[PDB]
Chain A
Amino acid sequence: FVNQHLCGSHLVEALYLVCGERGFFYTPKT
């Protein structure tokens, strides 16, 4: 696999693909 530059909703799409049915947590800094 290649490295990634992912901002905004693009990172959520990547998490979705990587994790599939496992699900995931999206946890930005506040």
Chain B
Amino acid sequence: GIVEQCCTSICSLYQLENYCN
């Protein structure tokens, strides 16, 4: 998931925004 993706690869701020409430 996002926590693993951002660490093992890269992720965008737009992808992180999917986890906002």
Question: Footprint of B on A, CB under 8 Å?
Answer: 1, 3-8, 11, 14-15, 18-19, 22-29
Contact = CB atoms under 8 A, between A and B. Distances in A.
A1 B19 contact: no
Contacts of B9: 5
B16 to A, nearest CB: 5
A4 B6 contact: yes
Given A27-B3, A29-B4, A15 B10 contact: no
A3 B13 CA distance: 7
Contacts of A18: 13, 16-17, 20
Interface in B1-21: 1-4, 6-7, 9-14, 16-17, 19-21
